[PDB]
From a paper:
In N. gonorrhoeae, the best characterized and most clinically important multidrug efflux system that mediates multidrug resistance (MDR) is the multiple transferrable resistance (Mtr)CDE tripartite efflux pump. MtrD works in conjunction with the MtrC periplasmic membrane fusion protein and MtrE outer membrane channel to actively export antimicrobials out of bacterial cells. The cryo-EM structure of MtrDCR103 revealed that this multidrug efflux pump adopts the overall fold of hydrophobe-amphiphile efflux (HAE)-RND-type proteins and forms a homotrimer. Each protomer contains 12 transmembrane helices (TM1 to TM12) and a large periplasmic domain, which can be divided into six subdomains (PN1, PN2, PC1, PC2, DN, and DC).
To elucidate how MtrDCR103 recognizes macrolide antibiotics in solution, we incubated a 2-μM MtrDCR103-nanodisc sample with 10 μM Ery for 2 hours to form the MtrDCR103-Ery complex. We determined a cryo-EM structure of this complex to a resolution of 2.72 Å. The overall structure of MtrDCR103-Ery is almost identical to that of Amp bound (labeled as MtrDCR103-Amp), with the three protomers displaying the access, binding, and extrusion forms. In the binding protomer of MtrDCR103, the cryo-EM images depict that an additional large density corresponding to the bound Ery drug was found at the distal multidrug binding site. It is somewhat surprisingly that the observed large Ery molecule is anchored within this deep pocket. The binding of Ery is extensive; within 4.5 Å of this bound drug, there are seven aromatic, two hydrophobic, two polar, and one positively charged residues that provide aromatic stacking and hydrophobic and electrostatic interactions to facilitate Ery binding. These important binding residues are F136, I139, R174, F176, S275, T277, Y325, F568, V607, F610, F612, and F623. The MtrDCR103 periplasmic binding cleft is able to accommodate Ery and forms additional electrostatic and hydrophobic contacts with R174, Y325, F568, and F623. Likewise, the cryo-EM structure of the MtrDCR103-Ery complex depicts that there are 23 PE lipids that are similarly oriented as the lipids in the Amp-bound structure.
Numbering used by the authors:
A (entry chain C): 51 to 150
B (entry chain B): 1 to 1043
C (entry chain A): 101 to 250
D (entry chain C): 699 to 748
E (entry chain A): 300 to 349
F (entry chain C): 848 to 897
Write the structure that this text describes.
Amino acid sequence: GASAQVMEGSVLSVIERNMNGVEGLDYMSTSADSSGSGSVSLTFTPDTDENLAQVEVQNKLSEVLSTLPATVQQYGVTVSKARSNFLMIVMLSSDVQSTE
Amino acid sequence: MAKFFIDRPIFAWVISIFIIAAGIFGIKSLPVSQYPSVAAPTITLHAIYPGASAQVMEGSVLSVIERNMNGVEGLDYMSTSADSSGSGSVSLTFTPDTDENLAQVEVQNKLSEVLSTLPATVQQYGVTVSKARSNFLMIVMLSSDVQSTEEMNDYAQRNVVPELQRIEGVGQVRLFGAQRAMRIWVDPKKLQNYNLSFADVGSALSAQNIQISAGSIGSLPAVRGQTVTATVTAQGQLGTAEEFGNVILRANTDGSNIYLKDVAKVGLGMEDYSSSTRLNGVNTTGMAVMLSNSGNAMATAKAVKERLAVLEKYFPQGMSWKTPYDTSKFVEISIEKVIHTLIEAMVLVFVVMYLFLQNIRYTLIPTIVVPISLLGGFAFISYMGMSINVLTMFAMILVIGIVVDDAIVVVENVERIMAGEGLPPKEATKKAMGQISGAVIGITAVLISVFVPLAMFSGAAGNIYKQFALTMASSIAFSAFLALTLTPALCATMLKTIPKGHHEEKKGFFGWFNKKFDSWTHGYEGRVAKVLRKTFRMMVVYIGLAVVGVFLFMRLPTSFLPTEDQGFVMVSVQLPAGATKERTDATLAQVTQLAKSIPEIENIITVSGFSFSGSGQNMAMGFAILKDWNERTASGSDAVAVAGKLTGMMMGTLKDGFGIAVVPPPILELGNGSGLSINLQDRNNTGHTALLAKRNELIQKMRASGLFDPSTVRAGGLEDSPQLKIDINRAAAAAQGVSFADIRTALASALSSSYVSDFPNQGRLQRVMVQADGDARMQPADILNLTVPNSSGIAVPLSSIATVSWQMGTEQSVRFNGYPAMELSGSPATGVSTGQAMEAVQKMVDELGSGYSLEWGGQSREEAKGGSQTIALYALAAVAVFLVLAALYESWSIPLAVLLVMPLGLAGAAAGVTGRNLFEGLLGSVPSFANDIYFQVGFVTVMGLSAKNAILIIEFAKDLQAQGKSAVEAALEAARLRFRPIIMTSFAFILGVVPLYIAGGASSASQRAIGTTVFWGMLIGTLLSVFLVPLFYVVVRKFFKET
Amino acid sequence: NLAQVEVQNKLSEVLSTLPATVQQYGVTVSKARSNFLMIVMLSSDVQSTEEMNDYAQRNVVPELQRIEGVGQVRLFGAQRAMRIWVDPKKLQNYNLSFADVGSALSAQNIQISAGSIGSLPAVRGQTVTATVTAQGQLGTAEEFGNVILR
Amino acid sequence: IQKMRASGLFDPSTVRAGGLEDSPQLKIDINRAAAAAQGVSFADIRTALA
Amino acid sequence: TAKAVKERLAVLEKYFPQGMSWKTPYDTSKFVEISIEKVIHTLIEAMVLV
Amino acid sequence: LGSGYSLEWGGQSREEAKGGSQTIALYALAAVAVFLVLAALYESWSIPLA
Ligand SMILES: CC[C@H]1OC(=O)[C@H](C)[C@@H](O[C@H]2C[C@@](C)(OC)[C@@H](O)[C@H](C)O2)[C@H](C)[C@@H](O[C@@H]2O[C@H](C)C[C@H](N(C)C)[C@H]2O)[C@](C)(O)C[C@@H](C)C(=O)[C@H](C)[C@@H](O)[C@]1(C)O
Ligand SMILES: CCCCCCCCCCCCCCCCCCCC(=O)O[C@H](COC(=O)CCCCCCCCCCCCCC)COP(=O)(O)OCCN
């Protein structure tokens, strides 16, 4: 139940502003959509570890989680240190049952 | 190596170029801060529970959170603090060898599994989990005098805070003040008139103000033939006060709906209303900047100032920004002092070399070799992950005197060989290298073995010693490598052959100086020959001097860091129990009027509602910032004199309450003067009165029947205060139609506040609170008029249900390791060991019944450990030095003679410190020198220099005895040969340390503390060694006839 | 450490989809061995095993589970609590049920937070401030025995 | 995007925006005065829209 | 860990109520320490035999 | 376009920008390394120049 500007101005912008100062942070990118969702991607720099970066991001996010709206805290903010390009695509085919 | 690099100067030059490049790369790639991280990982929670006492908050939130924080890897101890302000704190101090990020994530995970068992309001406000470590950089104060403090806070949070935390190097920006919210002051008289309640207001605010989520028209699981889909929007929240004032509280059939503006008043206000900051009397908004790791302090401060100017170019009319305090100028002053010291040392070395060698091409070698050693040390400290701070700069300043002596001795030996044998520079350099290579290697090994144990201590003191150790040892190693690699090449290429007998036909001032120096050398040789004749009396005199030095060292006060004039003094004001904030504001105004009456104070910052001792309406604190050191060069102008004057003016002016001014010492983890802290814990949970009685009994035992300086033994917590407890009678309530939730609702609606809903105020969400019209809740006779509703109506005046009375309740609750604890702060007077005092305190606590324990807190936890690691480390270092000297000299007796010069420097340093203390005392001043870390560093430096000189003398005396000379003749020749380089190096070191002896200004305590020690130690050590080293050699040669 | 961090992250995402009782009791994550290193006894002849279990949970278990190397301390028992054994033969007489008992216990044993007389946002001329306290809670057996069901 | 096309360096049919193609939406403006004068609480509208 | 637990128990025994005691009839560190001592004795015997 | 509208890169393009000032630095570093190595090995300032 939020706009593309309310989600940023109330949830994403706060995390983006409080996520500065992390060691190895190269840049950030915030993207909110009209479906009531937002994504803050932090792209780190070389000479940086992945687990330490995730731990520092979680520490910075938890100390600022007391300011976000109540419904966001109910749903929670999920962390994903995963890639975005596809390696394989498995396809299941059948003629005796539907796709559901 | 000495002969390999003498025929290949280009290879040595390439190695030096690589070292310089690595040093420059490390210097450009090092963090910059005023002090390193010497504390341990600490995690804090800071829960919020408004409108509650200390016991309720503690037993409801803090105990529940503390009983689950058991099992975290690396937990040292934990403490719990609660007050009457409505806040709590659970501080977990972690054992070393622990990462603070892992500790914080573990604490958050442990709190996540117990958060659902806390009260509803605690979950609404939330529980934070942060780390106590902070790298403070600057303070940005915004003062308008034309706008409210809440307006300035909102402006800073909306246009200033997000602009400062985006700068390179900034790690955190913290605002001091409550945010903005929508406050509704509800008059209870209107509610009782319209027959309403606070629950009705809460329901109306939570129902009329809610976010609506509609969805999409033409959603995906649609019917065949859909071509358009659109998101549906619906606004169901309020954002202005007029909209909140139209909230319907009750709708009737005929109409006449009761709005929120008919029984209450809505408006924008603050969320806490507690703290208030003022700068010189005007309203101010506080913003604290914390420096980030792997960042710079000077560049970050400059960028912050530039951004602040660019923002003030858009500020409204009346606002103004200031930066009264900044910890980035201390490292600036330290770097400029290091550069000035390096330049002065180079000038002194040039002067002494031109005076003693009578040529100009001898002075270029030290000037070329010293900066390379400094760059190598910088590169090493950059490789080890260290940073540039005051301690590293002081270590670099202290190591300048040692890195030049290698080049000095090399050039002196080369020049002596060239003037004696008349050989060209190549052969003379080869001979000098073949003579002194093993000696240089042994000296380097001894210095490394002496400086290694400094980096093996535990605690904050160990972290402080590690900087000096890793800097000085690296600088010494690089200087040794340069003296073995580049110095011989420069001496062989940059020098020219001296004609036969060229010195004598020379005349003028140089001839007179040569004549005088030769006469002094002959006199010194005669005196040494006289000393080598009466060996028994000289040895007994040496033993007497050593025992006197040991006695003078053992009779010195012990400390960690001398108090430094940081440029500001803190002031804590406390009022009687039950005082409101108006009296505290009046006292703060009086304190400001008194502080601006002192010409040494530039800006005064007063904070009302917060103090380090406690947080309450009667507590207050302020920070009087002083002017620059250049404008405070007088007697009664330092921080201590200003603090004394402020205290004297407060004790004669402050009628209500008392205020004490203290100058903040160096790093608070290594804080001296606190004495000895104890925490008395109740094991069986007997109560508060029993624990207070036991605390009073322990205080009486330590004061009268003890030795803990009765002028210091006192409680350090907070005495009880009058309260207004309400004892409800369940029998009387059961006899009527009143339930027990009715009393709870009435008490929650009467005094305390409530957090009901949220609202968007121009982009950001803010809270909506109800304070119940504070005009009513002013007198104690207001709760006794609260009529609590019965089953049908409300007729009970609450005097038949409960009885109100006055009692003495605690205003602060403290727990230590899961037990109720009370803190005490004693102090030994003087000449009494802290170990025996701690044993006496432990025995006294054991005298009480089984169920009352004691535990140390702060620095006492480290003092509880026996001081055996230092003695063991020093013994191991001495054994390593003996082994290295035995491997060098190839004997078991010569190291015994070399090790006899250690007590000389110690006695000299102790005598110098005692003399300076006496001079300060007789002239009215107080003794400012003790046995601190700087004294130990200076003593280690002077003992290393004395060991180097003794090693050189003993090597020259031993290699001259294998040619057919006796011990006395060999010692005399070695002394006559080593007289000149020792004198030159001593003069250079003393003239370079003199600027640190009378240092006055920024960071002058540590400067003088190291300068006096090193100066007197070097002077006495040289004066004693030049006559006692040959004596020790002769004694060891005659006592242990070799194999 | 990282494995436990990711496990906590995965558990926090499905913790709200569990029953109310599981959230009341909570889910405990641990990393320790399944075998025992030692067994500590608390033999006595004056107190029963319930008092000894309570004392061990209050003073012995927390002191032992904070030692370096300890992964878990399982007490063969449980701490003290207030047990209410209801007779269903008597609930039918007064037409009562377990829901009434639970509601009475939750409504008559709730902590009260009063506040402060003379709070900070006050009138000009306020000199005295006092914290108001009310117990509103039961901690004794005969106090719980007097809970009003009707 | 317009000046990137027809410039020789970028080929057409590839220069595209990465936006979400801002769309028309339905806006529902609630009148609290009418809902109060007719006897409709603000929670009923929220339940109906949800 | 066993040594630390035993030391903590010996320290906490001073606060126990009158009547109760403590003991660890099941402990695995004793076997380890006795095995280490036996192996050290065997090493000393081998040294003297050589 | 004017001021205020800056430009940022995404994906490999940023890396391509990083390849704008690193090539000259790499070439200079290789040249100076060869010079220093030759001067240290052959003991001359003229051989590496040639
Ligand atoms: C170099 C270490 C510095 O420590 C801090 O700055 C920390 C960050 C604050 O304490 C910390 C202490 C801490 C950690 O306590 C738990 C924290 O929670 C609070 C906010 O202040 C300080 C003293 C600020 O106090 C706070 O100023 C705010 C404008 C209002 C706030 N008040 C409403 C409460 C008050 O406390 C204040 C005034 O900037 C101090 C300025 C004036 C100084 O000159 C002093 C010398 C500081 O440079 C400092 C002590 O050297
Ligand atoms: C009569 C005889 C006279 C003989 C000679 C007289 C006195 C000569 C005095 C010479 C002074 C030399 C000054 C050196 C300039 C220091 C520049 C430091 C640059 C830097 O950051 O570090 C370098 C680049 O690293 C990177 O990879 C960063 C990438 C960007 C670097 C941009 C620099 C381009 C090339 C500049 C030349 C570099 C100097 C040559 C090394 C690598 O240094 P390092 O840490 O690798 O050191 C090797 C450790 N084993």
